[PDB]
Structure 1
Amino acid sequence: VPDKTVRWCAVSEHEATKCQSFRDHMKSVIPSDGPSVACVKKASYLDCIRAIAANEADAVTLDAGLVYDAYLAPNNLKPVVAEFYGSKEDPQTFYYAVAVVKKDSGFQMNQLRGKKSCHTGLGRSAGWNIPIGLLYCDLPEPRKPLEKAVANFFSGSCAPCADGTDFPQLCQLCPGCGCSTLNQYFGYSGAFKCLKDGAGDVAFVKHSTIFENLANKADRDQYELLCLDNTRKPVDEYKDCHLAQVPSHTVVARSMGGKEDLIWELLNQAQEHFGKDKSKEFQLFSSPHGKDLLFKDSAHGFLKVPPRMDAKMYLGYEYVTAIRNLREGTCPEAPTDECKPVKWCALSHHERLKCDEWSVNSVGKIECVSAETTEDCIAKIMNGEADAMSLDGGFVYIAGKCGLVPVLAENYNKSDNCEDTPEAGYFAVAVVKKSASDLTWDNLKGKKSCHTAVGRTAGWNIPMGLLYNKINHCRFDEFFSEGCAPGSKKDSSLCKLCMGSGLNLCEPNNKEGYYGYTGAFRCLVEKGDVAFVKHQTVPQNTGGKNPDPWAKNLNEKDYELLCLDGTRKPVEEYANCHLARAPNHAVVTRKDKEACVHKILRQQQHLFGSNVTDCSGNFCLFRSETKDLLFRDDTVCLAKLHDRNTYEKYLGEEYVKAVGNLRKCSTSSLLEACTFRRP
């Protein structure tokens, strides 16, 4: 009872015709057990969104700005399949927004009031959000509501889907403002036709539609596009003269009911048959009944959206911030004198505890928002609830690739000039027992292991890079008999040998008993053959430096470190054989908060930093009870970084090459999302 079916949501009768041919072709290819397309006609796109949220429909294509309208509650939509516009030699996900005009009209961009404007729709990306955003702050109060103010800015215009009854000026050129292809001015080519008729004085479309509608070269030689710096250029330097980039159109579907896989299979067979002119008897991206039906014309293929990326990560941060200031109607002045309090991020009830105590011991400049894993908190910095975070270099790689900058670094060496001197970076080692002296680097196979966390420097990158040269296989639970590396998948033996219980085994927070540096060392002592930690671990857990019992009884002259060539070196000399170097931990944040995070944290390190003795009973920022929380426990001060604020200049060449060698084996889904965003 009843089997699988895919349904599509249609806008007009042209969508019903093209959807009908699409149905018969896609039932022609797929075997009879595979599901097929259906067609559900709706009047408008917004009614189609409520048709998806009330399960009458499954999938429909929107813009970027309309995706922002579909994201909101109670709609709860999700972007699942995007589309690229380039050739198959190089896919491009973003496209440009330009403003075409008539030749010899002879007017600048800045004084464009009182003219005729044609828009492709209300809330659409290259038609509405970019032009009103660029023109926005020049209008006088009252700015809310926006359509009233823009209606007073132009002397009449055309903008479909806008309300004619509450606003008559928006339908002053188009007598019905209809959200369908029945309106001849709706769409990209409808707005270009609004310029071509001469009724409109300026139009706003992508860079490719003037190539779509006109075939003659002289017709292109007439129509011109205005530049952002108030100049004039002809058409084909759209890469020179554009307003902004926008994300592509996206098939959306609901989140809980799904389903992504079936749509992606169907559109995989669609893109392999019908995209780049394999079949003459049917085209998917062009149609004679009308253009831009069910899909764009300038699309050339479909790309799967990763399961991590939701809509706020899809649109970016500048685009959501601009569209939220544009809906709410606020021109930011921001004079930049004082700083709003920093929203630091924590994780799981020990970081959250410490962070709250620091939030009260500071006068109010620091407030704390918690996540559960560190990837989830980095995403929570990107979409904009959390400001700053301290994390190791293997995550400075990921967060730097996602678009964040490091500001302050951690120092590990005590000096008078520690605050200004760029330190060199700590060493990563592997510790073995004294009880087993048979262990060499040439033979690690089938013998147990202990790692700090999946994705770190000394626990992951430095080991599995140098191992990845020798094993040359991407899996690692076959090379080791079993080990402990939290943050891996639950089916593995690597998560099986770890400690925490119940349901918290292999979970990468402090609620795992074997998590982190001291937890990896406890993995080695209790059940481990080799561990992978920093060089500073053993003197900090040797000899009652922990009041914990298992670390109270131990000694360092037993627990020894092994080399790369196989020769056992004693513990005090780490420089004769380190595995590889690792850069220091660094604090990352968004680019707009860099000055306030910098100015606040330099104030905070003075009051609560390492010169504050009498640590028990009073507050210490860096001293913890060897859970290594919010910061590494042996930090002295935190170094100011001038001239080196990117991920690549901070991490450096050898390390970026090392992770680049490891890069086809990393399974972190956030890395996949931040790679998919790139063109």
Structure 2
Amino acid sequence: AQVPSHTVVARSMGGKEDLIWELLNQAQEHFGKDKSKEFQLFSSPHGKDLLFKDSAHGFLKVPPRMDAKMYLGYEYVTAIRNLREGTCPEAPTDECKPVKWCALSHHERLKCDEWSVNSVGKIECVSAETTEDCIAKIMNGEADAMSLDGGFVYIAGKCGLVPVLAENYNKSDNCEDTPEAGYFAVAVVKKSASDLTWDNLKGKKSCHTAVGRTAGWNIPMGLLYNKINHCRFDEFFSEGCAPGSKKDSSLCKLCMGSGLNLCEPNNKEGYYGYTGAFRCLVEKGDVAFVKHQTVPQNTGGKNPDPWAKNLNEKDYELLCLDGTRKPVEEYANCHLARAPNHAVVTRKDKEACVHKILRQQQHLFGSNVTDCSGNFCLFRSETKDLLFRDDTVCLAKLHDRNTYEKYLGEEYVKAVGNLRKCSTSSLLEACTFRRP
């Protein structure tokens, strides 16, 4: 079998990490690979394998997100734990243990617990606070599956998770078998600011869904990465609201949640998501980056919220990439790029059980259930997109395409790959240290 490297350990709180890495780095550059004939770091005459291996040839920094349980991987931790305890598992494939779905930040937990009781017991809820913690919680084993957009299905695909089911966003008599081509990503501006152009967005206020999402982050900032040639985007825009950013940027200086819940990438922030970014555009923004169906859901008096009842579907307008100004009703003229649908991800060994429990579960609580208040609906939520996106008709079966690079398609994977050197999420770094 293969094993991870030997490692230098340290304490969890007192550390100190930077001083060990400073010392071993400056030792590495002078004494490690035969730079000085006088002293050797990797050999000694009287004893061998002292203080280090003899077969080692250099040091690598462990990223700050990766702890021991992520360092060893899931298979090796399961091997050492079942070897130490001594179980030697049987695995009958008939029964299946219930699925530990992962939720986040108390607006997902209420609807998740209600779904755990409305189901007979097959679904149980374990939660986190940000989605990067919940992906790691799927990796370690405390969780089983969740629903992510393609920007995080890319990251969890790097960490070693596969997608099982996809979400359809168009109604049909046969939606469960028919694969969907994906939704569109648009930017929305107002009629009052008719001077705005895709050629010139500099110093204008931008509204994003969250850091790392497809229609909010990857598709716009990839094109802007081709134009600006800067990694930083707080310089091109004056202000804006992009949840999940660092606190020091102006991209958190326009957001609205308070206090200490500012730019938290969850439902505690008012400007999080698609609809929250639309509130960023209505209240304080100049441009928003959302999906193409954001304006018809929120406008027309469909939200019972006070901010959205007075909004009209006509006066907003969504701009193309050439510089033409074209209205909302035809999205097919003005789209930046095709974005793939949201998917349900899980580990490899729980692939079949999440498949069976979710198809069996969506037949009972799915889209045919009318009289939603007074009963339970899995997909219908209170306008905040809880556990799923509110326009999800059904979950399409994926056969022959269960891999992040297969499911996400070539153009979007290349589009994220042009933004590969620029992303600052620590979890992608921690999942990319594994690769030699």
Cα deviation, residue 335, structure 1:
1.1
Which of 189, 209, 233 matches 1:476?
233
Q: How far apart in 2 are the matches of 1:493 and 1:577?
A: 28
- Aligned-partner SS, 1:569: strand
Cα deviation, residue 525, structure 1:
0.1
Cα deviation, residue 420, structure 1:
0.4
- Aligned-partner SS, 2:250: coil
Q: Which has the larger radius of gyration?
A: 1
Q: How far apart in 2 are the matches of 1:542 and 1:511?
A: 23
Cα deviation, residue 458, structure 1:
0.2
Q: C-alpha offsets along residues 63-111 of structure 1, whole Å, 9 cap, x if unaligned?
A: xxxxxxxxxxxxxxxxxxxxxxxxxxxxxxxxxxxxxxxxxxxxxxxxx
After the TM superposition, which parts of structure 1 deviate over 3 Å for at least 4 consecutive aligned residues?
Answer: none
Cα deviation, residue 544, structure 1:
1.2
Cα deviation, residue 416, structure 1:
1.1
Cα deviation, residue 274, structure 1:
1.1
Which of 127, 139, 163 matches 1:406?
163
Q: C-alpha offsets along residues 396-431 of structure 1, whole Å, 9 cap, x if unaligned?
A: 000000000000000001001100011000000000
Q: How far apart in 2 are the matches of 1:674 and 1:456?
A: 18
Q: How far apart in 2 are the matches of 1:569 and 1:579?
A: 13
Matched, 1:433 2:162: no
Matched, 1:664 2:421: yes
Q: C-alpha offsets along residues 3-48 of structure 1, whole Å, 9 cap, x if unaligned?
A: xxxxxxxxxxxxxxxxxxxxxxxxxxxxxxxxxxxxxxxxxxxxxx
Q: How far apart in 1 are the matches of 2:130 and 2:294?
A: 23
Q: How far apart in 1 are the matches of 2:379 and 2:87?
A: 40
Cα deviation, residue 392, structure 1:
0.2
Q: How far apart in 2 are the matches of 1:574 and 1:404?
A: 33
- Aligned-partner SS, 2:370: coil
Report the equivalent of 2:342.
585
Cα deviation, residue 618, structure 1:
0.5
Cα deviation, residue 607, structure 1:
0.2
Cα deviation, residue 279, structure 1:
0.3
Q: C-alpha offsets along residues 354-396 of structure 1, whole Å, 9 cap, x if unaligned?
A: 0000000000000000000000000000000000000100000
Q: How far apart in 1 are the matches of 2:110 and 2:16?
A: 39
- Aligned-partner SS, 1:654: helix
Q: How far apart in 2 are the matches of 1:451 and 1:272?
A: 43
- Aligned-partner SS, 1:677: coil
Q: C-alpha offsets along residues 325-367 of structure 1, whole Å, 9 cap, x if unaligned?
A: 0000111011111110000000011100000000000000000
Cα deviation, residue 461, structure 1:
0.4
Q: How far apart in 2 are the matches of 1:573 and 1:248?
A: 56
- Aligned-partner SS, 1:409: strand
Q: C-alpha offsets along residues 584-612 of structure 1, whole Å, 9 cap, x if unaligned?
A: 00000000000100000000110000001
Cα deviation, residue 317, structure 1:
0.2
Q: C-alpha offsets along residues 437-472 of structure 1, whole Å, 9 cap, x if unaligned?
A: 000011000110000000000000000011110011
Cα deviation, residue 289, structure 1:
1.5
Q: C-alpha offsets along residues 494-528 of structure 1, whole Å, 9 cap, x if unaligned?
A: 01110100001111000000000000000000001
Cα deviation, residue 661, structure 1:
0.1
- Aligned-partner SS, 1:345: strand
Matched, 1:488 2:245: yes
- Aligned-partner SS, 1:473: coil
Q: C-alpha offsets along residues 302-340 of structure 1, whole Å, 9 cap, x if unaligned?
A: 000000000000000000000000000111011111110
- Aligned-partner SS, 1:462: helix
- Aligned-partner SS, 1:470: helix
Q: C-alpha offsets along residues 561-583 of structure 1, whole Å, 9 cap, x if unaligned?
A: 01101100111011012011100
Q: How far apart in 1 are the matches of 2:242 and 2:193?
A: 21
- Aligned-partner SS, 1:278: coil
Cα deviation, residue 674, structure 1:
0.5
- What runs of 5+ residues in structure 2 fail to find an aligned partner? none
Report the equivalent of 2:70.
313
Q: How far apart in 2 are the matches of 1:490 and 1:475?
A: 14
Q: How far apart in 2 are the matches of 1:456 and 1:337?
A: 37
Q: How far apart in 2 are the matches of 1:647 and 1:612?
A: 32
Q: How far apart in 2 are the matches of 1:266 and 1:622?
A: 54
- Aligned-partner SS, 2:412: helix
Q: How far apart in 1 are the matches of 2:187 and 2:335?
A: 9
Q: How far apart in 1 are the matches of 2:329 and 2:368?
A: 27
Q: How far apart in 2 are the matches of 1:516 and 1:642?
A: 30
Cα deviation, residue 276, structure 1:
1.2
Q: How far apart in 2 are the matches of 1:368 and 1:379?
A: 16
Cα deviation, residue 474, structure 1:
0.3
* CA RMSD between the two structures: 0.5
Q: How far apart in 1 are the matches of 2:46 and 2:276?
A: 66
- What runs of 5+ residues in structure 1 fail to find an aligned partner? 1-243
- Aligned-partner SS, 1:377: helix
Q: C-alpha offsets along residues 250-285 of structure 1, whole Å, 9 cap, x if unaligned?
A: 000001111100000000101101111010000000
Identical amino acids, percent of aligned pairs? 100
- Aligned-partner SS, 1:588: strand
Q: How far apart in 2 are the matches of 1:571 and 1:456?
A: 22
- Aligned-partner SS, 2:226: helix
Q: How far apart in 2 are the matches of 1:483 and 1:346?
A: 27
Q: Which structure exhibits the higher relative contact order, with contacts defined as CA atoms closer than 8 Å and separated by 6 or more residues?
A: 2
- Aligned-partner SS, 1:550: coil
- Aligned-partner SS, 1:370: strand
Cα deviation, residue 616, structure 1:
1.1
- Aligned-partner SS, 2:255: coil
Which of 117, 120, 125 matches 1:360?
117
- Aligned-partner SS, 2:164: strand
- Aligned-partner SS, 1:564: coil
Cα deviation, residue 543, structure 1:
1.6
Q: How far apart in 1 are the matches of 2:245 and 2:29?
A: 34
Matched, 1:384 2:163: no
Q: How far apart in 1 are the matches of 2:136 and 2:46?
A: 43
Q: C-alpha offsets along residues 151-185 of structure 1, whole Å, 9 cap, x if unaligned?
A: xxxxxxxxxxxxxxxxxxxxxxxxxxxxxxxxxxx
Q: C-alpha offsets along residues 96-140 of structure 1, whole Å, 9 cap, x if unaligned?
A: xxxxxxxxxxxxxxxxxxxxxxxxxxxxxxxxxxxxxxxxxxxxx
Q: How far apart in 2 are the matches of 1:274 and 1:445?
A: 50
Which of 185, 194, 204 matches 1:447?
204
Cα deviation, residue 556, structure 1:
1.2
Cα deviation, residue 617, structure 1:
1.4
Q: How far apart in 2 are the matches of 1:406 and 1:345?
A: 15
Cα deviation, residue 551, structure 1:
0.5
Cα deviation, residue 625, structure 1:
0.8
Which of 617, 622, 628 matches 2:379?
622
- Aligned-partner SS, 2:156: helix
What's the TM-score once normalised by structure 1's chain length? 0.64
Q: How far apart in 2 are the matches of 1:570 and 1:479?
A: 26
Cα deviation, residue 669, structure 1:
0.2
